[PDB]
């Protein structure tokens, strides 16, 4: 808690590390949520929802 | 006074100076005096 909260505000290197970590985690979390809602909005329309997927003849 | 060593000075300066608000009073031909934001930015060093 207070250790990181005192390092981030007092040393720019720690703040820069915090920015990089936040970018990484936030971009992954939005990629994940945006794909979850995309999957929910398109039920049955996926390539792997094809019933005959695997029998061409 | 003797109890005030270099580490004490740095601790006190970090309490009172580092990234702190400042009050400015100026008079005369002061157009080249930098604005409040410049003074405020110069209270910390981003290289550290």
């Amino acid at each position: 808690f207070e250790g990181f909260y005192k390092l981030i505000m007092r040393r720019n290197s720690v703040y820069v590390t915090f920015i990089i970590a936040g970018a990484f985690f936030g971009e992954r979390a939005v990629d994940y949520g945006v794909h979850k809602l995309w999957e929910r909005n398109n039920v049955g329309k996926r390539y792997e929802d094809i019933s005959v997927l695997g029998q061409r003849p | 006074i003797d109890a005030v060593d270099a580490s004490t000075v740095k601790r006190v300066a970090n309490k009172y100076i580092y990234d702190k608000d400042i009050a400015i009073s100026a008079i005369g031909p002061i157009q080249d005096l930098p604005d409040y934001n410049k003074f405020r930015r110069r209270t910390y060093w981003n290289r550290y």
């Binding site: 040393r11 290197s13 720690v14 820069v16 590390t17 990089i20 970590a21 970018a23 990484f24 | 290289r47 550290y48």
Partner: peptide, 28 residues
């Protein structure tokens, strides 16, 4: 303020390298 800063800026550089290049799988 010189060794601690060097360590901090090295940690930031390593984190930024892990963030730009994401070799999750090269931990072998």
């Amino acid at each position: 303020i010189d060794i601690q800063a060097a360590a901090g800026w090295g940690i930031a550089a390593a984190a930024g390298a892990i963030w730009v290049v994401q070799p999750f799988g090269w931990i072998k």
